Design a protein around this ligand. Sequence first.
Ligand code: HEM
Ligand SMILES: CC1(C)[C@@H]2CC[C@@]1(C)C(=O)C2
Ligand SMILES: [K+]
Length: 406
Amino acid sequence: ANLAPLPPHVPEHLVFDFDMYNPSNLSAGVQEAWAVLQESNVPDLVWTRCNGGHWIATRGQLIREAYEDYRHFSSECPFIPREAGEAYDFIPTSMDPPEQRQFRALANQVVGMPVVDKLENRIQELACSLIESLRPQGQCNFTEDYAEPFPIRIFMLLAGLPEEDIPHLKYLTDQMTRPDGSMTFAEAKEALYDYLIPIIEQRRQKPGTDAISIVANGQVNGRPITSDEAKRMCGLLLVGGLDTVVNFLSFSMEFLAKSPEHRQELIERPERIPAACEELLRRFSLVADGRILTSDYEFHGVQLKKGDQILLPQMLSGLDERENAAPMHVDFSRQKVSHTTFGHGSHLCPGQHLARREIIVTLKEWLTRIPDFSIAPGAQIQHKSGIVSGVQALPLVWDPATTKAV
Ligand code: HEM
Ligand SMILES: CC1(C)[C@@H]2CC[C@@]1(C)C(=O)C2
Ligand SMILES: [K+]
């Protein structure tokens, strides 16, 4: 295919041409497609000539180690291909400690556990209303009818943005994680910034109680945050709010629809939902970004060159059979659910608490109202791969007679 010429410093035996935006075994499921990187024929650290050429760490050990060592593995250029990585200037993700710290503190403020706790009632409220509205229909297009509106509307409420702007923003955020080829990466990013700029200016002058007002008027390093810094942070918040939980919920529901035994498990033993959420986060992990080498560095017997990009798939740690036995099997009773679904190191996800709350609320409220459901007959669910992977469509069906109006 479109393979870049092999750099002189890369041993031929370490080459494995994996395409993160279109993996070969995608039809088997996106996580399954990525897991081919963990078969016996693939070394721990390999070089793919796809997408401009870059390294890929395939084991949890290397992924965790790399995410911790920011001195060698910089977040300055975190996305593949390099073009995207270089245009990517979100805050604080494109920064390494110490610089990142002050901005991350501010981000924790607007999406951290305290915010989640205060927002739980709205989360509960929306989940219940959306699910009840669908219950009597006996069918739904999950991605469009719940997966997107639920987490996204909660985020828009948090950020104090009009739901009317969702379609526009959602299209843009997805061009940065799973480009469909209709927009260049930098242009999609700028479009996001063009939208935010006037809003940030407005909320710095006349601050509201929303997350954007909080960010735009925050302080970093003992001084006021700049309009541009606030912009670069809010841009990141939009992506996290619009293209993370949204995708994960579909992977989870697709699975539950296909496994009555697991649904039954959660209906008969509700207290197991939190554990189930965690196991699902491992099995259907969906993120994969990376870092750039700050200098020549030998890593686990492999010579890495300054400038080289290395993909450190957050998705792979939990699927690594070295971290979890029978990794592709969902066991809600797994004693130790090991994963790096929310990242690792200084950039570990601050919105993970909001994510878990939304997932757990979704599982409890959906199963209590629509306990029995399955994939629409004749439907063949397909996935999409990228920085954040997802489910293209998920047609679900159930018998309204077996549902319960709460
Ligand atoms: C299932 C849901 C989610 C997953 C799997 C996820 C995953 C991740 C991962 C892997 C990282 C680290 C990436 C890196 O090291 O380069 C991260 C960072 C981040 N996430 Fe999440 N995330 C989720 C939901 C959210 C939500 C809902 C928000 C908030 C709107 C959010 C906001 C952020 C921010 C601000 C960062 C950057 C933190 C920093 O750079 O210090 N995330 N997330
Ligand atoms: C890799 C991510 C999941 C993380 C939050 C949104 C995302 C796409 C980023 O750009 C940082
Ligand atoms: K950059």
